[PDB]
Amino acid sequence: PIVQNLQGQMVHQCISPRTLNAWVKVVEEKAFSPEVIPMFSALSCGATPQDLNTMLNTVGGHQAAMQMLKETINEEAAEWDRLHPVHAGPIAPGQMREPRGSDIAGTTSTLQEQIGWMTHNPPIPVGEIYKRWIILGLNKIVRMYSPTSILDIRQGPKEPFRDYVDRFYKTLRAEQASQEVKNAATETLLVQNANPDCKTILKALGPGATLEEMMTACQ
Amino acid sequence: PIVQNLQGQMVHQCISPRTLNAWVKVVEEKAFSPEVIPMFSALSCGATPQDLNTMLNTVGGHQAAMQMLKETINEEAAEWDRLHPVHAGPIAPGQMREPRGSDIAGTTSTLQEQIGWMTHNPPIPVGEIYKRWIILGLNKIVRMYSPTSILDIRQGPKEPFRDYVDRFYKTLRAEQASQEVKNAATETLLVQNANPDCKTILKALGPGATLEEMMTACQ
Amino acid sequence: PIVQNLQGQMVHQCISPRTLNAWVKVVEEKAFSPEVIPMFSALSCGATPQDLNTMLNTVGGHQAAMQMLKETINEEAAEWDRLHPVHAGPIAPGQMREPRGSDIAGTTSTLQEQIGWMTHNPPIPVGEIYKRWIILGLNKIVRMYSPTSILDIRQGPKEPFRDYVDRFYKTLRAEQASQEVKNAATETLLVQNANPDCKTILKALGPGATLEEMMTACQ
Amino acid sequence: PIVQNLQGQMVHQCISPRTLNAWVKVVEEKAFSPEVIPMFSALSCGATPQDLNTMLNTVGGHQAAMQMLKETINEEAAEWDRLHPVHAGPIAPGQMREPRGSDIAGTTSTLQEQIGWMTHNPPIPVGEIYKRWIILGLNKIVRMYSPTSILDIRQGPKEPFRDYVDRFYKTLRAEQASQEVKNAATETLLVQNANPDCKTILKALGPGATLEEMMTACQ
Amino acid sequence: PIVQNLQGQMVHQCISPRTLNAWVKVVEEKAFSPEVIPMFSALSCGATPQDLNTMLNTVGGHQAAMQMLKETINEEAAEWDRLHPVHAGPIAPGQMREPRGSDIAGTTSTLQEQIGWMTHNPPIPVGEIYKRWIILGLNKIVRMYSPTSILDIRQGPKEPFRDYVDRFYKTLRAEQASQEVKNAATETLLVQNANPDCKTILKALGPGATLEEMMTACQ
Amino acid sequence: PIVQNLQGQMVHQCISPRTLNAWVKVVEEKAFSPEVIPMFSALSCGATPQDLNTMLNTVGGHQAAMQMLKETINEEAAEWDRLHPVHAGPIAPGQMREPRGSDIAGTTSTLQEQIGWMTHNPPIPVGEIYKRWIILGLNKIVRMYSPTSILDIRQGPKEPFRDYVDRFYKTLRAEQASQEVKNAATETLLVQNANPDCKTILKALGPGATLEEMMTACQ
Ligand SMILES: Nc1cccc2c1[nH]c(=O)n2Cc1ccccc1
Ligand SMILES: Nc1cccc2c1[nH]c(=O)n2Cc1ccccc1
Ligand SMILES: Nc1cccc2c1[nH]c(=O)n2Cc1ccccc1
Ligand SMILES: Nc1cccc2c1[nH]c(=O)n2Cc1ccccc1
Numbered sequence A, B, C, D, E, F: 001p002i003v004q005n006l007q008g009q010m011v012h013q014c015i016s017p018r019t020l021n022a023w024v025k026v027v028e029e030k031a032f033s034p035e036v037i038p039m040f041s042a043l044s045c046g047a048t049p050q051d052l053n054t055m056l057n058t059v060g061g062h063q064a065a066m067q068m069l070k071e072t073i074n075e076e077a078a079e080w081d082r083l084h085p086v087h088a089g090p091i092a093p094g095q096m097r098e099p100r101g102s103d104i105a106g107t108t109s110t111l112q113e114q115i116g117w118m119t120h121n122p123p124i125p126v127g128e129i130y131k132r133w134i135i136l137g138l139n140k141i142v143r144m145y146s147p148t149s150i151l152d153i154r155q156g157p158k159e160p161f162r163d164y165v166d167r168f169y170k171t172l173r174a175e176q177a178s179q180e181v182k183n184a185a186t187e188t189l190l191v192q193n194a195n196p197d198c199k200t201i202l203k204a205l206g207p208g209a210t211l212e213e214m215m216t217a218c219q
């Protein structure tokens, strides 16, 4: 990554063994469960595009996903290139060239170029722009590998309300609803899919009810 | 987080793999047992709002809880906004804008804004204000998920006094009594819920007795 | 904690995940065995009162003990207040206020106040004064939870002498005899509680004998 | 490795126990699965040729592979020597000599020479040139130890499409196709080797289809 | 411990959790096997007397040993006091007082005093003088707890020579022979205690033989 | 070890718990398998002679080996003394004395002397000279404890060629052939010891063949 040192300046640091192993192990344990995304974002704090490729490339399984991710990355890089074309031919000697999509993606740029962009004044945050593309791709994968529709999350006749709400919001998170819809489906789909006993209790609460109130009610 | 470096100044540091993993593992092991709160507070030492969201978002289970927590956060942010309204429209070029509730919560503010608030003179401690809101929410969850009323913690006929007192103060901690009540329930509910043999001993001690004295007595 | 940095000055550092976990795990494994006290003292090297509360609060079990400890802390704080009363009302603007017992205990003082006391010239070592109170409490707990009287540690007819001496000094340590008595009980209670065969050997050694000599003798 | 310190300059640092153990354990667990290569590249971030030999030499098994790797290294060193011959005899006192192939490979050069090359202005990046040779060799080994031809990766009659695509791109990665071919084999060999039910679905999609679309289709 | 920092001076550092745990675990695993001594010496690199007591005090078992060790420490402290008496009464204000035996042992000296001695010019290396006393005690314990006399280490009729030599030098190490005797017992007791077949081979080698030669011979 | 700090100079650092434990565990797991040597060399990066003795002394088993190693060390020290005799009697006050063999071996030299040699201008690299002697000894041990002659490594009738080559080069490595012979035994002993089916294939390849080619051929 690029870090600030102890005596004030932005420099390249080797990606740590601890980071490398954390990422590989989180993928092995959690696959594309939605919580792996914030974990990825945090393990790649300060990452250069090289570091991002490193983390992605160290994953051994899930090669269908990694291939979908390449595709998403390619589409963002092409849109980057549409937006910010680079003048071709020879660069002014010893000057910074402008990044193309593939440069931001780390496939046509050196570490040194990526460092120069990232620490320039003003900076071109290539590590952050690439990370956004990756996360975009990753979220598509989370969604795709979500094993259950929220329409099938329904409270069992003797399933504790809490356990049902846990299933419901876990599913919703993977299906990747807006926080409008997570804020919203509470007074609607959550009640509808409650079991008959709990449902009567919830209806009787009246609308406006917080989730806490609903969860107390069906305790 | 924001840390002081080795050569004197406040700077942003990447959240560590060790921290990330510690938090995730404490939740996996202890769920909402009350001791997870001080652990959270300590693992988020120096956290920016981003770091706080990071820790929260890396949790995979307990999505009912995380949704209740969002709700509590929203209520605090709205109260923040009631107290400290921000003038709308365009900000003075290159100046610090004032944080809204959603800014403190990290959903409408960048890392750089959060850093600027936190290291400004005078500072706006957004990481600490958000952390307080989170802990407020978390304590509600602890309480909610407390599996037993203190009224049902009663000493078994051959349950050692110590084990009963352990159950009692563990329950009380989750139900989240004041330290008045933890100081207090000792000369009252603790004795009442003791078994007949120990209860006679405790009554006979007379009032004023410390817990130590009571625990020696019913040894 | 408060540490010296690499370039010479006393500053606050976040309590580490390693420290937090070490303490929690030592309690889980060893409960109130007497060796947990020096471990606590060492894990809380440089601790502020906040850090001390942190470590204590992260403990999930043993809530009878933690409540006894609160009581002991309260008694020391009240004695502190007897000794060092603070003038009430409003403090001189921008000056250091004097710590009360509850300030030293971290319940009525901020982190910033604790830092100011601890790094002032001359310093008020609040972290060390609180730690002493805690250890005082902890030693009472060790003693209380000691499962066996030294009067019941007696050498078995075919128990190796070493194993008996191990039991004896382990018990004595928990019962918390002075080092006079640990130096002393060797030529007396240790011999008395030896088995008949070893006892004859020890008597015949004559008095003055070191423990080494006794342990060689009954090999 | 060679790292930048905290106060601005390039210096030699000891290879860490964590790094040493990570590499050895990745080989033990993953052998020559293709993801071990980016792991190697990242664990050897900043490596001198000595460090590279260290990592390679700490591997206990796979000595056929390590011997093939020596051979590949020898061929690159000889090509280096063809390109960049060094004038023989005695070097100018106290000056930097020019690296030969065996110098870059760490067998005829000291640590101090390697440091001097690597930190000279302008630098001779011997650690990076050797690393490239090693990776060249390693990729040959990955390919060689690939247990299955992509021609034999065919979807089972009730094998989920995702699992088949995972097998397919895992195999392709080891066989080490170009990213043209990974981009390409999608609209061709991937469909051909799909099972009859999924194949009809895919054909009917029409060409142009992304992998995501295909994977949704055969869900 | 006392360490040099990164910017040149000797300062107190907290004993690390890693160190604390390493020591406790080495004792748990290896008890008083002779290799625990160099491990202790190395884990206590730079230790103050406080740190030394810390490590010793964190040990939970082996209290017979720890009591023998106290005794040995007391005897060295008394000899220290015989050699280097301290003038009694009041010390020159703000000056360094002279250490007594109990000061070096950490029982009557503060951390600050120990730091002042250790970093004074010229220094009084109290941490090293105490460590020597401890190791003296520890070696007595190793010897005492050695379970087998070297006179009973004899090669089994089908015990490989190597395994016998391993037993022999392991025993000798615990019994704590001089390196004269370890250099020496090779051409004598090692041969004598060899089995008949190997013994003939060794005799026939003639004297002067290295251990390597003997071990090859009886392969 | 001796390390460069962060602010430019060579200073003594405590050997780390991580290093100490890594070395002990590598010996426990791998004994004298040949890969333990480069691991030792790397874990002792920057070591003083004291550190080298530390690592060696922390090993609990293998005392026959450690005794052979002492002997080898003694022979190198005596050859050192033959080469570089030191003038006896009293040293010039406050000057650096010249190292003897036993000084380099750490048995008659203090830490401070070893530091002075190692950081002098010009330096006497005692840590590196001793390390070379140790490795010399260690390689003799590797060879000695090699359980199988390369003459007995022969391909089984249905043993995959790769597995046989793995056995062959593993054995050769322990027997410690030159890299001439490792480069060489490929077109000769490796083919001879192949099984009849593979042998015909290899002969038919013709000479000049790389190992890769041979391994492909007998796939
Ligand atoms: N494993 C993985 C997943 C996604 C992108 C990746 C990788 N490995 C890489 O090097 N990249 C960058 C890259 C992007 C677009 C097309 C080709 C390669
Ligand atoms: N997992 C979690 C729990 C609580 C708050 C959270 C999260 N994740 C976030 O990003 N936030 C902030 C946020 C607060 C309020 C409403 C929407 C989101
Ligand atoms: N777990 C624990 C044990 C002992 C003291 C503690 C704690 N947690 C705290 O915050 N404190 C300080 C405190 C002291 C006195 C009375 C109330 C609280
Ligand atoms: N284990 C391993 C694999 C590949 C190259 C290696 C090693 N160990 C080394 O020292 N080298 C360098 C070297 C290259 C070429 C020929 C001889 C040795």
Ligand SMILES: Nc1cccc2c1[nH]c(=O)n2Cc1ccccc1
Binding pocket: C179, E053, E056, E057, E066, E067, E069, E070, E071, E073, E074, E105, E107
């Ligand atoms: N566990 C242990 C073993 C040896 C010495 C120790 C300890 N704990 C201590 O505090 N000391 C110092 C001390 C030396 C002499 C007599 C009394 C105590």
Ligand SMILES: Nc1cccc2c1[nH]c(=O)n2Cc1ccccc1
Binding pocket: E179, F053, F056, F057, F066, F067, F069, F070, F071, F073, F074, F105, F107
């Ligand atoms: N365990 C070990 C193996 C080899 C040499 C060692 C040790 N321990 C030491 O202190 N040394 C140095 C030494 C060399 C020569 C003769 C006597 C001792």
